[PDB]
Symmetry: D2
Subunit: 331 residues, 4 copies
C-alpha cells in the first residue's frame, strides 16, 4: 500500500486530498499542530488508514522524525499560514512557515533519502498569489510580482522546490493552483465569508455583510477537483510545475450577484463596504492558463463557477438553518 | 480604564481571566494564532463591542509581540501562551521549548524594550507551573527545588528563571505564578480530568463504552481555573513583584478522580476503564501538592471550589454535552 | 550628522561602505555577531572615537534588530548581512534562508514598526545579488526573470520581493541593489577570485605548490567592492526608491581570471591548477553579465576599476601577504 | 577508531578537547559556523583525523545531517554564545543557541539512535554560572539562581539533558564546569582581558586598563585540564553530572595582584573603573566542590591559580612583544 504524508492535513485541501488518496488505497499520515481546542473539524468524519502526528513546519526535528518513522512514498506540503490579509499582520511568522518551512521539509526529505536510500515524490502547494500584479492570463512561466508577505514567501518556497529538483534530482513538483473553494473553505476567505453570511441573512440571524474590494477578480475552482491534480502530477514520469485553474475569472461583485440572486435576494440590500478589509497592496486580477495541466495530466475542472457558488450557498444555508434552531431552542 | 494584554487568550485560563478582568472594568486585548479552523470557542460568547480585542501574533515571532505591545500600550501583560501538554512535549520538544521557554523571553524582552523606548510602566505575569517541581517530593512551596521530568517542565523552569532575572536585573514588575493543576468545563480534552468527564458523559448516554487511561496512581493538587485567574491578577496589584504558589494544598490520585466522577453518576469506573501503556509518559511526575501559605498570607487568596465540587461541576457540564451529542447522533447529524 | 545603521558591517562590503559613509560625515553604527574569535579584521583599522559604533545583534533575532533601531534612530539602514556563500548554502540551506530571506523581512518589519511607533522616516537598502538571475541568460537587467540555482539565490529572491512589497504596500523608501559580483583585497578567501590570488601569492613565494579549483568556464561580471558601495549610497539619495543593477557589463571566465593573475607574475597557471570535483556546485550558474544602464542614467554611477586593474590590485595585495607569511614561516612563527 | 563530534570546536574548550581526543586516537569531527572572516584561529595548527563541517545550533537540520553522516560514538556540545555580559544584549539569540540549541542536538542524537539503532554518548557543557547568586561552595545539587539570560539558558540545557537521560536512558552527562581559562581564552573575558592588556602595557603599547567589578570572586582553572574531565565522564559505566573546579576562589583584584606583580608592576597605576563593565545582575562568588569528580572520575586539577595566571601572562607578553615589533617595523 502506498504511503502518503500530508502536511496541512487539517486544512481545506488536506481534508479533500485525504479522502481522495484513501479512495485510491493509500495509507495516509498527516502532521497536525497541537491546539488548545479541537482542530480536526474537517477530518473527524474520516478519522488504521489515516494516522495523525504532532509536528510543526517551524520545527525541523519534528518533520524529519515523522518522515523517518513513516517512510512515505509521497509527501504533500500543504501546510501554511494561508491568508493574505493576515500575512501583513504576522509577516515574520508567515515567512517562517510558508517559505523556510517548505525548505525544512525539502531538506528533511532529501536527508531521509540519502540516509535511507529510499525514493520519495514531493508536492509543493504553490499559489497564483505568486503572480501578484502581473496581468492575466497567468501560465507557468508568467513573471512573479508578489503583493504580500504570504505571496513573496510562496515565491520563495516555489524556488526552493525548483532548486531541489534541479540540484538534487528530487522528484518535486510545484502545483501553481489558483483560488479554490468549497463548503470547507476558511470563513475568513471572501467566498466562504459571503456564503456563510448569506445563509445567516436568509434565516434572519444576520442583517449586514461587511466587505472590502468588490472589484477584485479571481479564477475560482472547487477544492475537491484540484486535489486530484496534485496527485496526478506525482504520477508522471518526470517532475514539473503546473498551473491548475478554471481559466475563467469573476469579480467578488459577480460572486455576490450569483450567490444572493440564487436565494432571491439583492446583495445591495445587505452589503456595506468597510475599508478595514482592503489590503495594503491588492492583487487585481488572476486568471489561469491551465493548458499544460490539461495536455500533460489530462486534468480538467468538473465544477464550474456558478455550480461552485451554489454548492457553497446550499451548504451554508443548511448550516444557518441548524443555527436558527439552536438560537431559537434556547441554545 | 486599565489595559491588559493576554497571550494565550484562547486557552482555558485566558478565557476565565478575560471574563474576570472585563468584570473589573479592563479593556482586554488578546493575541491569537491564525488557524485554518475557528480557535475562539472558549471566548466567542465574550467577544459577542470594544472591550475585548483580538490580534494575530505568535510567541515564536518576536516582531509580532513588540508590534502589538507598541500599539496597545498595555498596563498589565499576562503570558499564558504555551504548548501546555506534558505528553505532547515529548513528541515536539523543540517547538515546545521555542514557545514555552524562549517565547517567554521574547515577550519579556519586547516589554522591556517597549518600556525603555516609551518610558511607560508595565506589570508582567508569567504562567509558571507545578510541573517545574517534577519528581521533587511534596509539599512543594516557592523554595522547593525544581527537578523537571519533561521538555515542557524544563521549558517552564527556563521561563521562570528568565522572568526572575528580568525582575532582578532590570527592576521589571514581573511575577511568576507557580500554579498547580487547575481544571474546568473548558479544560482541554487531552488532559486527564477532562478526558475522564468527557468520556463519562458519553458512557452514561451510551455513546461510548470504554475509557482508556495510563497511570492511575499519579497524584495531583486540582483546583478550579476560575478561582486561579483571580490569583494572577492579585499578584500584579501588590506593592512589589514576587513569585507565588497557587494551589488547594490537597492531593488526589487519578483513581480517586474516577471514583468521585463515575460514582456521582451511579457507575463503577472499573466496568469501563482499561489501561493502555501508550498513555504512560517516558518520565512520570508522581505527586504534586502545593503549599500556598504565601499566597494566602500576602494576596489573601484562597480557593473557593473544592475537589468534589470541581469534579461534579465538570461531570455535570460534560453530561449535558453528551446528551446534546446523543440527540445529534440519533438524528443523523453526527 | 546623518546616522547610518549597517548590518553585515564586518563583511567585505560593510567595511568599504563604513569608510565611504564616514568620509561623507556620517555617524555609522554596525551590528555584529558575537564570536569566540575576533571578527572585526576588516574594520579594526577604522574603529581605531564616536563616529563608528558596533553593537551585538543577529538577523535571526528580531528583538535585537528592533532594540538597536530604537536606540540608534538611523536615517539610513543598509542590510548587507548574509550567509553570502553559494556553495555553503547547499550545506546549510535552512540557516541560510533564515538569515538571507526571513532575516531581511525581520529588519524590514523592525524598521516599519519603528517608523510607525516613532513617526520617524528611514531610508532602506537591501543587498540584492545577480545570483538571483541564476540560469537566466545574459545580459541581465532589472526586468530579467529570476531562475535561482541555489538556496542562497532563492533566499535573495525572497528578500528582494519582501523589500519591493514593503515599498509598494507601505511606501517605505526601500531600494534593492542588484549588484553583480564584486571583489577586493578584503574578499572572503572562499570565493573564487580571492582563493586564486591568495594561492597565487603563496605559490609565488614557495609556500604553496597546487591550486585546486572546480568549474573554470563559469563566467562572471566582476567589479571592485569599493566602487559598488558608492552605488548603494546613491540609491538612497534619489527622490524616490527603486531597484538598480550595479555591474561592469563585462564578463570573464574563471579561466581568464587565472590567465591574467598568474600571467601578471610571470607564471603559467596550468602548471599549478588541478580540478577537484568537490568544488563543483549541485546546480551551476553559467554566465552573469549585467546591464547597468539604469544606474548610469539615474544615479550617474559608473565603475572606476576595470577587470585587469581589479585582478592586479588583488594579486599585489595577496603577494605582499604571502611575503609576510614566508618570513614568519621561515622564522618559525607560523 | 572511536569517533567524536564536537560542537563549538573553534572555541577555547573545543580546541583543547580536539588535541586531547586526537592524542587518544580518536577521529574528530567539528561543527563550525560559516563566517565572513577566518574563524579557525585556535585549531588551524591541528588542521584525515580532524574534519570540519558547516552547521549551526539554531539549524536542527544541519545537526541531524552531520550526525547521520558521521555516526559519532561521542558527542560533546560545547557550542554557545558563552559571554555573560553579551547575553544581556542578545538574550533571544543566546537562548536559542544555549537552551534550545542544546535540545535540538539532544533530539537529533535521540532521533539518530532510534532510526539507526546506534549508541551515542553525550556531554553537555554546563556552567557554574547556573548557580548564580546561590552562595558557595557549590556542588552538584546546589540550587540554581541564574543571574543572566546566558545562565538561565544553561540551566535550561542542563535540565533538558537530565530529562533525556531519565526519560530515554540516553547516556548524557552534564559537566558543571567552573570558570576555566588559558592563553586561548576569549579576550572579552576578564582574565584574558587583563593578561592581554598587561602584556601591551609592559611593552609600551597600552597605558590604561578599564575594568568593572574587581570584587567578584571566581574559581579559575586551566581549560587544558578541564577537557580531560569531559572525556572521563563519558568513560564511566553510567551517565551522571559532575562539578569540575579547583575549589579555590579568588577575586578579580587578586588576579590583578598576581599578574601585574609578576612583571614587577603595580596594577593600580594602570587600572581604571568603567561602570559600563558592570553587569545588570552580578554573580558575586563562585567556588566549586569537586569531591564527586575526584572520587568517581579520579580527576584533579594540575594547574593551580598562580600557575594559570602566570601561564597566561607569559603567553600574552610574548604576543605583545611581537606586536611591538610590527607596530615599530612600520606594520
Ligand atoms: N486554497 C487556495 O485557494 C489556495 C491555497 N494554496 C495553498 O495550498 C495549501 C492548502 O490551502 P488550504 O487548505 O486552503 O489552507 P488552510 O488554511 O485551510 O490550511 C492550512 C493548513 O496548514 C496548517 N498549518 C499552518 N501553519 C502550520 C505550521 N506552522 N505547522 C504545521 N502546519 C501548519 C494548518 O493547521 P491548522 O489547522 O492548525 O491551522 C492547516 O492544516 C496552503 O499551503 C495554501 O497556502 C495555494 C493556492 C490557492
Ligand atoms: N492549566 C494548568 O493546570 C496549568 C497550566 N499552566 C500554564 O498556564 C497557561 C495557561 O494554561 P491553560 O489555559 O490550561 O492552557 P491551554 O493549552 O488551554 O492554552 C494555551 C494557550 O496558548 C496559546 N498558544 C500556544 N502556542 C502558542 C504560540 N506559539 N503563540 C501564541 N499562542 C500560543 C494557545 O492557542 P491555541 O488556542 O491556538 O492553541 C492557547 O491560547 C499555560 O502557559 C500553561 O502551560 C500552569 C500551571 C498548571
Ligand atoms: N560580494 C558580492 O559579490 C556580492 C554580494 N552580495 C551580498 O551583499 C552583501 C555583502 O556581501 P559581502 O560583504 O561580500 O559579504 P560577506 O560574507 O563578506 O559579509 C557578510 C556579513 O554578514 C554578516 N552576517 C552573516 N550572518 C549574519 C547573521 N545571522 N546576523 C548578522 N550578521 C550576519 C557577516 O558577519 P560575520 O563576519 O560574523 O560572518 C558579515 O558581516 C551580502 O548580503 C551578500 O550576500 C550581493 C551581490 C554580490
Ligand atoms: N569557559 C568557561 O569558563 C566556561 C564555559 N562554559 C561553556 O563551555 C562551552 C565552551 O566554552 P568556551 O570554549 O570558553 O567558549 P567559546 O566562546 O570560546 O566558544 C564557543 C563555541 O561555540 C560556537 N558557537 C556559538 N554559537 C554557535 C551557533 N549558533 N552554532 C554553532 N556553534 C556556535 C563558537 O563558534 P564561533 O567561533 O563561530 O563563535 C565556538 O566554537 C560553552 O558552552 C560555554 O558556554 C561552561 C562553564 C565555564
Ligand atoms: N478575505 C476577504 N477578502 C475580501 C473581502 N472583501 C473583498 N475581498 C477581496 O477578495 C479577494 C479574495 O480574497 P481572499 O478570499 O482572502 O483570497 P486571496 O485571493 O487569497 O486574497 C481579494 O482581492 C480581497 O481583497 C473581505 O471582506 N474579506
Ligand atoms: N493526559 C493524560 N494523563 C493521564 C492519563 N492516564 C493517566 N494520566 C496521568 O494523569 C496525570 C495528569 O496528566 P495531565 O492531566 O495530562 O496533566 P499534567 O499534570 O500537566 O501532566 C499524569 O500523571 C498523567 O500521566 C491519560 O490517558 N491522559
Ligand atoms: N568558490 C569557488 N568557486 C569556484 C571554484 N572553482 C570554480 N568556481 C566557480 O567560480 C564561480 C564564482 O564562484 P564564487 O566566487 O564562489 O561566487 P558566486 O558567483 O557567488 O558563486 C562559480 O561558477 C564557481 O562554481 C572554487 O574552487 N571555489
Ligand atoms: N568580562 C569582564 N568581566 C569583568 C570586567 N571587570 C570585572 N569583571 C567581572 O569579572 C567576573 C568574571 O567575568 P567573565 O570573565 O566575563 O566571566 P563570567 O564568570 O562567565 O562572567 C564577573 O563578575 C565580571 O563582572 C571586565 O572588564 N570584563
Amino acid at each position: 500500500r502506498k504511503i502518503a504524508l500530508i502536511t496541512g492535513i487539517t486544512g481545506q485541501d488536506g481534508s479533500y486530498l485525504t479522502e481522495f488518496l484513501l479512495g485510491k488505497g493509500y495509507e495516509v499520515h498527516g502532521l497536525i499542530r497541537r491546539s488548545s481546542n479541537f482542530n480536526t473539524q474537517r477530518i473527524n468524519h474520516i478519522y488504521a488508514l489515516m494516522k495523525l502526528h504532532y509536528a510543526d513546519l517551524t520545527d525541523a526535528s519534528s518533520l524529519r522524525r515523522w518522515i523517518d518513522v513513516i517512510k512515505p512514498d509521497e509527501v504533500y506540503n500543504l501546510a501554511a499560514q494561508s491568508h493574505v490579509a493576515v500575512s501583513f499582520e504576522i509577516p515574520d511568522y508567515t515567512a517562517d512557515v510558508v517559505a523556510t518551512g517548505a525548505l525544512r521539509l525539502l531538506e528533511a526529505v532529501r536527508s531521509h533519502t540519502i540516509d535511507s536510500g529510499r525514493t520519495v515524490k514531493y508536492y509543493q502547494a504553490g499559489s497564483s498569489e505568486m503572480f501578484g500584479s502581473t496581468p492575466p492570463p497567468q501560465s507557468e512561466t508568467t513573471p512573479f510580482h508578489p503583493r504580500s508577505p504570504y505571496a513573496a514567501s510562496k515565491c520563495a518556497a516555489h524556488w526552493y522546490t525548483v532548486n531541489y529538483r534541479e540540484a538534487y534530482g528530487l522528484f518535486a513538483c510545484n502545483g501553481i493552483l489558483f483560488n479554490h473553494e468549497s463548503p470547507r473553505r476558511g470563513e475568513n476567505f471572501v467566498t466562504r465569508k459571503i456564503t456563510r453570511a448569506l445563509g445567516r441573512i436568509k434565516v434572519g440571524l444576520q442583517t449586514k455583510l461587511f466587505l472590502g474590494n468588490l472589484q477584485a477578480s479571481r479564477d475560482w475552482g472547487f477544492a475537491g477537483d484540484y486535489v486530484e491534480a496534485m496527485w496526478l502530477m506525482l504520477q508522471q514520469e518526470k517532475p514539473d510545475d503546473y498551473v491548475v485553474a478554471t481559466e475563467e475569472g469573476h469579480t467578488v461583485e459577480e460572486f455576490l450577484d450569483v450567490s444572493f440572486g440564487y436565494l432571491g435576494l439583492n446583495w445591495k440590500d445587505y452589503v456595506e463596504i468597510d475599508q478595514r478589509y482592503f489590503r495594503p497592496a491588492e492583487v487585481d486580477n488572476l486568471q489561469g492558463d491551465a493548458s499544460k495541466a490539461k495536455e500533460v495530466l489530462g486534468w480538467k475542472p468538473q465544477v464550474g463557477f456558478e455550480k461552485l457558488v451554489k454548492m457553497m450557498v446550499d451548504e451554508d444555508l443548511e448550516l444557518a438553518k441548524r443555527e436558527k434552531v439552536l438560537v431559537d431552542a434556547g441554545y
